[PDB]
Design a binder for this molecule. Structure first.
Ligand SMILES: Nc1nc2c(c(=O)[nH]1)N[C@H]1C(S)=C(S)[C@@H](COP(=O)(O)OP(=O)(O)OC[C@H]3O[C@@H](n4cnc5c(=O)[nH]c(N)nc54)[C@H](O)[C@@H]3O)O[C@H]1N2
Ligand SMILES: Nc1nc2c(c(=O)[nH]1)N[C@H]1C(S)=C(S)[C@@H](COP(=O)(O)OP(=O)(O)OC[C@H]3O[C@@H](n4cnc5c(=O)[nH]c(N)nc54)[C@H](O)[C@@H]3O)O[C@H]1N2
Ligand code: SF4
Ligand code: SF4
Ligand code: SF4
Ligand code: SF4
Ligand code: SF4
Ligand code: SF4
Ligand code: SF4
Ligand code: SF4
Ligand code: FCO
Ligand SMILES: [Fe+3]
Ligand SMILES: [Mo+6]
Ligand code: NI
Lengths: 532, 136, 249, 714, 170
């Protein structure tokens, strides 16, 4: 059983704090600790044991045990397992000690739980509203199961935005350069405040969650089990198969569900095919701010032949719908599989020539070095997970630590650079394109065979687990608890860029105005995945 | 993966497709005035997932090869049908779609139910009144 | 302040003056040969945004028809609305509405923009884009294909005309339904359909089972067609399993 | 995962529940091998325990003491300190300025147990100095206990519940076993399984009337005429044990000369039942060797309730079926501790152990044992006339303890007006009920499942229920609150547990001396009178073996001429209203209103049973909302159209809060017992044009009701 | 050669304990919390009516997805495969199948905050074969003989008068 050593270390460091512990799967572990001793346990597992704060979230278990539940998912990466730290916040006085003064990665999860559930982490410095809009009435906490109906819409208190932006390094003489929410080539709402002195950015604050639909509440009220796979696809058009596989594996880990052999690694094939689509889009956007546009339209061309295998492996463009809880909906056939193999190869042909642009190295040496540097010291604290943390030096990858859809039968390579520039994050994505093309080269020629679907099973109530996938921008951790045979009790999703966002203040600092859209797009944000 | 069209000659009024629609593009309401069930499809809600053609008992709703769907007014999105409800033969409360009951009777005649339609009074009886029949 | 409200404070769609709305046809025939379109992305997934940006891509072009994307609402003659109106996004969308010069053309893009899509009844959305501003042209899809985007813009500019219309109740509703594939007994057809759906797919499974059904007419002859024509190992495994289901029945 | 043996807190059948408890939470209820149930429980015993978890389905459970500062003010939460200092200063001030009798104090009958009733009456009679104590046996079998005390001598159930299984005939008269005490109905089932014929006298076609060799469908309120007719058939056909009527009873000639004027042909129309089946019923009851009479609320809850009990018990003397096993008169009790509250002395005319207060010897004994000089002697005022004494200006304060008089009392407008002029109403409850909202002082109490005590079944049988879980709001048991209140202004009154109170009880009662905790224990059933703590006395199954416990030792015959009920069927009120229970939910719906499995079967506004012909012709369909109008109010319930109710009357249910039928009930109290007439009042049912507006009027009034109780309590 | 639970109407007192027992032995499980047996009343008789578990099943014939099949001598319906076509509730000659779905978990029926305008109300109830709520997916609810439970049916066990008994042919 994985995770015994960390539990023993927690027991010897803290003798009588672990009130209860249980195993979800072999590599999944949860512990219930004391409420007043919570920040020491998570800080210990974070700093001393080398754990990364993946996701933390609240729960409404007042009719299950009479208490709120705040979970703290930690990824052990020094074998490698999942540890969740659970606390039982009191009902009529919801207050638990905060982790943000100890672990900086707990700054927005503890701001989200102030809004969705109304729980109060005492000692949290950033007390501003995060997810709910500025016109939201105060005490309506949406994710409380008895606060309001999902269909209720309060009257907007204000038409103007009342958000407060902090200026850490600037003063009352600095000007601001908005870059949202309605900006061209941003293609997605998100506000930015560049506190500039000239063209240099002194400080940078931002307002997000303009695309907060509220699908966490809607996934547990109006919508079932097989239908949330459609909700996960319609979050963003480019992580659709990442969210669906992350949600599906959360529900199949919550029960047994011994999925058939080829239905695992076909999901591994389509997970990598999607990162051909998303990385080559970012590399096209990397050339549209570096300068050349005949490097963009051409990355659009190699993106189209990545869309051509996505046309034949599924038959759809963007949002799809190919996974169910037991297995995959539509199934690949022989010629599709022989064909995808050399269109993978001709892309490796085309990708090599198009990557000869950085070999050219003129705006790819002066515009993309020393710009938007992310400190690996900072990236370790805030627990970034995408190509950000792989460029900064940490070999953080879900497919190597935790093979979820049969990646152990596929050739896995983790690429980590040393520089922390924009050009370093492009080199992460360039080596990931060849890596994903090696898996398409080695996946579709040796399928194990067998069935595709496992259905007819009954959902055991109040069973939960963690589901994870390797999205193109990092990992998405999906935690879902089964409610009954039809509905979910609670489904929580954290986007790949949700962990990535709180370090944009430390990238845009010291840079210029002109390359500031390049710094934001260097990590390839998916606002719709993080805004939920 | 084009527009869902419904064949009204083959829809039996079983909210199967309505229950499987994630975006509630398909809606049914029971109109006691007219004794009819108002089946409706809205293209302004449809996310083109294809669950409706998956769960249709009689394959009436299909997604065609039609992708040119822009309109000037919102009411052109709607596909509407009305099916006469079947009144009970013990009480007279409307309990099911008459076309659905006739389709069920046709299904039972095929696999071998020689006297299916001579038992039509059992099929056009509400399940509450059918439970009172076996009590006596 | 920006938008009108009820007595409760819930927002309502704006009502343009008829003096302002009287010259929309003249504006359309003015911008028939040159349309300035500003994307107003609201609370929606990138799908309904990247495909709109793909309307000027190599596969589908918009400048050949005169459509040029503008950087400001002040330059806009057509305001393209994309996502479901989030409560945080109603005020910027309204600001983009009043910033444009009157009269305007509004095009709702996608299911999420037409009526809210899958988030139609939810506390953080106001529904579709017609719940805040008037909408002239509705373009459905999730996401709309670039052919649909070109058709929507061409029909908005008068180059094409509307194709689909409403269908109401009629005589065909009460005509009885017929048994499909009413040759063998319904149990086996249902069982082999489920067996093909488990192994192939919704789509592939109906297809394989229906091929098998036409081949139940001549056992050996079309067993042979399914075995030889495809030469697909996978299709052959699907047919063998379906055949064992029917045989054991 | 340990099992705690408890006694079901709903009805007087006294079933034993094996509450399985893990951690400090209850997971399930199991059927225990008790004396009464023997491993069979109804739905309320199986799935009626989850009201203690504060589910807030109907009403929020109480947490803190709350003091209302001025009527029109609000219930604002307060510490126990001043909640109880206020309830001592105000009570002492009232007993100084007005009188000891200006105070009035109820006793509970549901989950508090016997020891709480004993300490409550001890508090009242010692600290207060009043006999103003009345449980809700007043609105229950008060006519039954009064008639039995005047006629046979002992006012309790004279035979065991388990003794019905071996009778030769069961005579059910105005009692519904299948909906009130389901295990008693199962006992009647096995009695029919042993060969006993069953005669049911009920206007409806109840489930017990189905297992019956013959059933009597009589007119509402015509019990005396039928009883006199069948007694005349017994006498004139000379069918009785005269040996018994010559040796053991007294007063036969007056009964003979007063019943002879009531032959069956004259009542063949007042009782609406033909003479041939009356003769068959009288002959069948006379020739049965050992036969029992079971009567309920179709007897006592009338103007002529006491006289009907006298007639039934006199007719039992004629048949000679009184004092032998598998026979006797069996008034089946109501709540699970109403027989316990009767024994413990929570009545305004008796001390604990069925000792009356008119005797100065008992008034010297209890003054010696407690500590004041002599306890007050005046028979006290009753809870049914409490609005009458409050409006007239005779009673000033009401210590309501574990009842709901704003839902379960007649003429609810008069109750509301009484609570407005009553300057203080102290409600000691476990829920925010209707009365708990209109209370000037409210004290939270420990529920049934979280304390200890003694319950008494319908057949006078003591039983023990044990503590399962701890309370989660530092709130104390009822005897603790009573003891602290008495300490803060009067007597030093302190108790450690209920065993000390039970030992004090056995010291003060010669009839409960043999009922000790260790003899009862886990699965014990000890039917008082038990006199020896030895294992010699396991209880007393039947009464009247050798003496009738009468001052003469001889039973007395009595009956009178039938008189009509007070309200008459008039032009605009042609419909008889009878307020009748049902299985599934319990009275006032505080508990069973917070149980999800029980509230998932029937929620609101309830079903008023309509005869098919009556609705077919008045225009009312099988599930339609119906405006039911009376002289004192108009309310809405649905309609359950079936031919089981008799024509001309509707049978309707008072457990519902929206559409409660107690607004319609005009209170006409009995002549001497002062019981409200729930089983007969004149109404008119009328349909509603727009059912959707009335259906919305169901919902918003149901939500505005829950808005008040969730505002005051929280 | 079929297993079914029958009710003795002479022994049934109409206590609705069987309804609450069947509703709770499935609510603790994942299945539907609607009782699968309903106490039917007339003038002279009273007995719950449930699935007869017929030797030839008209419900299984009309099923489009083969959700109804015979296993262990009992006609068992898989609630994870039913597509709410409601054809089994028509072909059943005894009215043993009704249709209900799952409410949102741990959420009350009326959770309308007074801080916002109230949500639109539910449509009026007409019949389980016609009704549709957007948040509720109705499923054919039938007596499954408590096959998941290890101590037999909960209706037979928790009957106060022992009216229900399991009829079993090999
Ligand atoms: N119309 C009409 N009215 C009737 C009747 C009728 O047939 N028709 N029946 C009458 C009869 S026979 C009776 S007995 C009465 C019964 O009616 P009530 O006297 O009202 O008795 P309950 O309904 O049990 O009221 C119980 C109250 O006590 C509380 N309680 C429960 N357990 C405990 C406990 O352990 N401790 C404390 N402190 N409180 C507790 C409950 O929360 C609730 O507030 O109703 C009478 N009213
Ligand atoms: N489920 C449930 N069980 C309860 C209770 C509860 O609230 N819920 N309450 C308990 C209490 S508090 C009590 S007192 C007992 C009482 O329980 P029961 O004695 O059974 O009382 P009811 O059901 O009110 O009345 C019994 C019968 O009296 C009939 N009746 C009405 N009018 C007349 C008449 O004029 N003559 C005759 N002969 N019959 C008539 C009615 O038709 C009904 O069939 O029940 C207890 N059991
Ligand atoms: S599923 Fe098919 S038959 Fe049923 S309502 Fe929909 S279209 Fe009609
Ligand atoms: S395609 Fe999907 S969203 Fe559209 S009507 Fe069918 S089920 Fe509903
Ligand atoms: S229409 Fe579809 S793709 Fe476009 S924003 Fe809405 S959900 Fe996303
Ligand atoms: S008869 Fe009374 S004690 Fe026994 S189970 Fe029913 S409600 Fe509980
Ligand atoms: S639980 Fe038993 S007595 Fe009660 S209705 Fe059901 S079968 Fe009849
Ligand atoms: S549902 Fe009806 S037809 Fe099917 S097995 Fe049960 S009783 Fe027979
Ligand atoms: S409701 Fe379910 S079981 Fe019944 S016919 Fe339809 S799909 Fe089959
Ligand atoms: S056998 Fe099981 S499923 Fe069927 S009615 Fe009884 S308890 Fe319910
Ligand atoms: N990649 C991606 Fe989408 C985001 N952020 C996910 O997961
Ligand atoms: Fe009917
Ligand atoms: Mo009573
Ligand atoms: Ni994304």
């Amino acid at each position: 059983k994985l995770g015994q050593h960390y539990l023993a270390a927690l027991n010897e460091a803290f003798p009588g704090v672990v009130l209860d512990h249980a195993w979800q799967t072999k590599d999944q572990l949860t512990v219930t600790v004391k409420v007043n001793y919570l920040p020491e346990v998570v800080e210990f597992l974070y700093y001393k044991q080398g754990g990364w704060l993946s996701v933390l979230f609240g729960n409404d278990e007042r009719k299950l045990n009479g208490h709120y539940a705040v979970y703290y998912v930690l990824s052990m990466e020094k074998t490698k397992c999942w540890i969740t730290v659970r606390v039982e916040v009191d009902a009529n006085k919801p207050e638990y000690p905060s982790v943000t003064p100890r672990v900086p990665a707990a700054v927005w999860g503890e701001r989200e739980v102030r809004d969705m559930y109304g729980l109060i982490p005492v000692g949290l410095p950033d007390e501003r509203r995060l997810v709910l809009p500025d016109d939201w009435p105060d005490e309506l906490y949406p994710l409380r199961k008895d606060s309001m109906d999902y269909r209720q819409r309060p009257a907007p208190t204000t038409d103007a935005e009342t958000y407060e932006f902090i200026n850490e390094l600037g003063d009352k003489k600095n000007n601001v350069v908005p870059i949202g929410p309605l900006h061209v080539t941003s293609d997605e709402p998100g506000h930015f405040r560049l506190f500039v002195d000239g063209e240099n950015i002194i400080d940078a604050d931002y307002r997000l969650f303009y695309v907060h639909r509220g699908m966490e509440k809607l996934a547990e009220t109006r919508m079932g089990y097989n239908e949330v796979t459609f909700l996960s696809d319609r979050v963003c058009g480019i992580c659709g198969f990442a969210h669906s596989t992350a949600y599906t594996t959360s529900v199949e880990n919550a029960m047994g569900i011994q999925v058939p052999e080829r239905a695992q690694m076909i999901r591994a094939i389509l997970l990598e095919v999607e990162r051909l689509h998303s990385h080559l889009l970012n590399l096209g956007l990397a050339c549209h701010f570096t300068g050349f546009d005949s490097g963009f339209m051409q990355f659009f061309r190699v993106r189209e032949t990545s869309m051509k295998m996505a046309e034949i492996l599924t038959g759809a463009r963007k949002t799809y719908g190919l996974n169910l809880i037991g297995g995959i909906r539509r199934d690949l056939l022989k010629d599709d599989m022989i064909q995808t193999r050399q269109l993978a190869q001709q892309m490796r042909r085309e990708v090599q020539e198009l990557v000869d642009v950085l070999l050219s190295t003129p705006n790819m040496e002066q515009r993309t070095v020393g710009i938007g540097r992310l400190d690996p010291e900072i990236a370790r604290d805030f627990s970034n997970v995408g190509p950000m943390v792989r460029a900064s030096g940490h070999a953080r990858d879900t497919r190597a630590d935790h093979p979820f859809v049969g990646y152990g039968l596929l050739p896995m390579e983790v690429h980590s650079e040393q520089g922390c520039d924009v050009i370093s994050r492009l080199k992460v994505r360039i080596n990931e394109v060849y890596t994903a093309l090696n898996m398409i080269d080695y996946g579709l020629d040796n399928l194990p065979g067998g069935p595709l679907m496992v259905e007819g099973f009954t959902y055991i109530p109040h069973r939960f687990a963690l589901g994870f996938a390797e999205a193109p921008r990092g990992d998405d951790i999906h935690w879902s608890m089964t409610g009954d045979n039809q509905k979910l009790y609670r489904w929580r999703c954290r986007a790949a860029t949700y962990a990535n966002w709180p370090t944009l203040r430390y990238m845009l600092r010291g840079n210029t105005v002109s390359d500031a859209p390049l710094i934001i797009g260097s990590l390839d944000p998916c606002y719709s995945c993080t805004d939920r | 993966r084009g527009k869902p069209e419904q064949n009204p000659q083959q829809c039996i009024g079983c909210a199967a497709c309505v229950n499987a629609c994630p975006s509630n593009a398909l809606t049914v309401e029971t109109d006691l005035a007219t004794g009819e069930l108002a089946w409706e499809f809205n293209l302004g809600h449809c996310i083109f997932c294809g669950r409706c053609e998956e769960v249709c008992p009689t394959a009436a709703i299909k997604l065609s090869q039609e992708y040119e769907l822009a309109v000037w007014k919102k009411e052109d999105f709607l596909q509407q049908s009305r099916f006469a409800l079947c009144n009970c033969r013990v009480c007279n409360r409307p309990f099911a779609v008459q076309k659905e009951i006739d389709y069920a009777i046709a299904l039972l005649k095929h696999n071998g139910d020689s006297r299916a339609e001579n038992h039509r009074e059992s099929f056009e009886t509400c399940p509450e009144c059918k439970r009172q029949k076996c009590l006596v | 302040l920006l938008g009108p409200r009820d007595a409760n404070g819930i927002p309502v769609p704006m009502t343009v003056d008829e003096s302002i709305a009287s010259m929309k046809a003249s504006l359309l025939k003015k911008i028939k040969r040159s349309a300035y379109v500003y994307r107003v992305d609201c609370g929606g997934c990138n799908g309904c945004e990247i495909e709109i940006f793909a309307t000027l891509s190599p596969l589908f072009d918009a400048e050949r028809f005169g459509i040029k994307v503008v950087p400001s609402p002040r330059h806009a003659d057509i305001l393209l609305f994309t996502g479901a109106v989030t409560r945080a996004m109603r005020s910027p969308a309204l600001r983009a509405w009043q910033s444009a010069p009157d009269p305007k053309i509004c095009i709702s893009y996608g299911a999420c923009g037409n009526s809210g899509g899958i988030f139609h009844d939810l506390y953080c959305v106001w529904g579709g884009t017609d719940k805040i501003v008037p909408v002239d042209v509705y373009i459905p899809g999730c996401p709309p294909t670039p052919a649909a985007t070109l058709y929507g813009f061409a029909m908005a500019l008068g180059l094409l005309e509307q194709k689909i219309h409403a269908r109401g109740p009629g005589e065909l509703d009460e005509q009885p339904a017929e048994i499909l594939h009413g040759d063998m007994v319904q149990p086996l057809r249902v069982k082999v359909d489920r067996e093909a759906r488990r192994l192939a797919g919704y789509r592939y499974g109906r297809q394989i089972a229906d091929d098998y059904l036409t081949q139940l007419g001549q056992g050996e002859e079309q067993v042979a067609r399914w075995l030889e024509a495809e030469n697909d190992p996978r299709l052959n495994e699907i047919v063998s399993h379906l055949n064992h289901v029917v045989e054991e029945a | 995962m340990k099992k705690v043996v408890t006694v079901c807190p709903y009805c007087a059948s006294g079933c034993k529940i094996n509450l399985v408890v893990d951690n400090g939470k209850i997971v399930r209820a199991e059927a225990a091998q008790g004396k009464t149930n023997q491993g069979t429980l109804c739905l309320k015993g199986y799935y009626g325990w989850d009201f203690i978890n504060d589910t807030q389905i109907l009403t929020p459970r109480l947490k803190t003491p709350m003091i209302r500062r001025q009527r029109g003010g609000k219930l604002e939460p307060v510490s126990w300190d001043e909640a109880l200092n206020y309830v001592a200063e105000r009570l002492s001030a009232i007993k100084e300025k007005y009188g000891p009798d200006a105070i009035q104090t109820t006793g509970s009958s549901r989950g508090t147990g016997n020891e709480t009733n004993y300490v409550m009456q001890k508090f009242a009679r010692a600290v207060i100095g009043t006999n103003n104590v009345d449980c809700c046996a007043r609105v229950x079998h008060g006519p039954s206990v009064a008639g039995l005390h005047q006629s046979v001598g002992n006012g309790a159930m004279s035979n065991a519940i388990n003794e019905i299984d071996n009778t030769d005939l069961v005579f059910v008269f105005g009692y519904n076993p299948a909906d009130s005490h389901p295990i008693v109905a199962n006992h009647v089932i096995n009695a029919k399984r042993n060969g006993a014929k069953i005669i049911v006298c009920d206007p409806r076609k109840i489930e017990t009337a189905r297992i019956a060799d013959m059933h009597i469908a009589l007119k509402n309120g015509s019990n005396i005429a039928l009883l006199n007719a069948m007694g005349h058939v017994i006498i004139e056909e000379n069918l009785y044990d005269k040996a018994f009527v010559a040796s053991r009873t007294e007063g036969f000639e007056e009964y003979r000369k007063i019943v002879e004027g009531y032959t069956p042909e004259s009542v063949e129309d007042i009782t609406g039942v033909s003479a041939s089946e009356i003769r068959q019923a009288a002959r069948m009851y006379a020739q049965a060797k050992s036969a029992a009479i079971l009567w309920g609320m179709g007897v006592t809850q009338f103007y002529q309730g006491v006289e009907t009990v006298r007639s039934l018990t006199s007719l039992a003397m004629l048949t000679g079926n009184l004092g032998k096993p598998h026979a006797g008169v069996n008034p089946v009790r109501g709540q699970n501790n109403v027989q316990g509250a009767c024994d413990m002395g929570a009545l305004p005319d008796t001390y604990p152990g069925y000792q009356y207060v008119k005797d100065p010897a008992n008034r010297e004994k209890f003054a010696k044992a407690w500590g004041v000089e002599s306890l007050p002697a005046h028979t006290g005022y009753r809870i049914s006339e409490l609005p009458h004494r409050a409006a007239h200006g005779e009673v000033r304060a009401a210590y309501i303890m574990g009842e709901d008089p704003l839902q379960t009392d007649a003429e609810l407008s008069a109750v509301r007006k009484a609570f407005e002029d009553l300057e203080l109403v102290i409600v000691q409850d476990i829920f925010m009920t209707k009365t708990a909202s209109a209370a000037d002082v409210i004290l939270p109490s420990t529920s049934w499942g979280e304390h200890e005590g003694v319950f008494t079944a319908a057949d006078r049988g003591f039983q023990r229920f044990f503590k399962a879980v701890e309370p989660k709001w530092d709130l104390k048991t009822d005897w603790q609150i009573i003891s602290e209140i008495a300490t803060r202004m009067g007597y030093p009154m302190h108790y450690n547990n209920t065993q000390e109170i039970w030992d004090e009880l056995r010291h003060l009662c010669p009839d409960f001396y043999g009922a000790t905790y260790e003899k009862m224990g886990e699965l014990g059933f000890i039917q008082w009178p038990c006199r020896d703590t030895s294992d010699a006395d396991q209880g007393t199954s039947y009464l009247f073996k050798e003496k009738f416990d009468t001052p003469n030792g001889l039973a007395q015959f009595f009956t009178c001429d039938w008189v009509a009920p007070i309200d008459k069927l008039t032009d605009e009120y042609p419909m008889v209203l009878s307020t009748v229970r049902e299985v599934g939910h319990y009275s006032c719906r505080s508990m069973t209103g917070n149980c999800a499995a029980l509230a998932a079967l029937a929620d609101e506004p309830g079903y008023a049973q309509i005869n098919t012909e009556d609705a077919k012709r008045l225009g009312i369909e099988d599930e339609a909302l119906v405006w039911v109008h009376s002289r004192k109010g108009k309310i809405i319930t649905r309609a359950q159209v079936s031919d089981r109710p008799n024509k001309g009357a509707i049978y309707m249910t008072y457990q519902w809060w929206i559409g409660a039928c107690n607004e319609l009930v005009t209170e006409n109290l009995s002549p001497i017992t002062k019981t409200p007439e729930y089983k007969y009042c004149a109404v008119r049912v009328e349909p509603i044009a727009d059912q959707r507006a009335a259906e919305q009027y169901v919902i918003d009034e149901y939500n505005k009701l829950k808005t008040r109780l969730r505002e005051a309590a929280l | 050669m079929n297993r079914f639970v029958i009710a003795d109407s002479t022994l049934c007192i109409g206590c609705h304990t069987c309804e609450a027992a069947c509703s709770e032995t499935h609510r603790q499980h994942g299945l539907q919390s609607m009782p699968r047996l309903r106490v039917m009343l007339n003038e002279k008789e009273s007995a719950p009516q449930l699935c007869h578990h017929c030797e030839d099943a008209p419900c299984a014939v009309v099923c489009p997805v083969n959700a109804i099949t015979r296993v262990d001598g009992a006609v068992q319906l898989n609630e994870s495969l039913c597509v709410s076509c409601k054809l089994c509730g028509i072909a059943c000659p005894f009215g043993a199948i009704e249709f209900s779905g799952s409410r949102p978990l741990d959420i009350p029926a009326n959770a309308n905050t007074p801080k916002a305008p109230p949500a639109p109300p539910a449509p009026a109830r007409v019949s389980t074969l016609l009704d549709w709520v957007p948040g509720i997916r109705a499923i054919a609810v039938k007596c499954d003989l408590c096959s998941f439970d290890e101590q037999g049916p909960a209706c037979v066990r928790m009957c106060p008068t022992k009216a229900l008994h399991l009829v079993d042919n090999t």
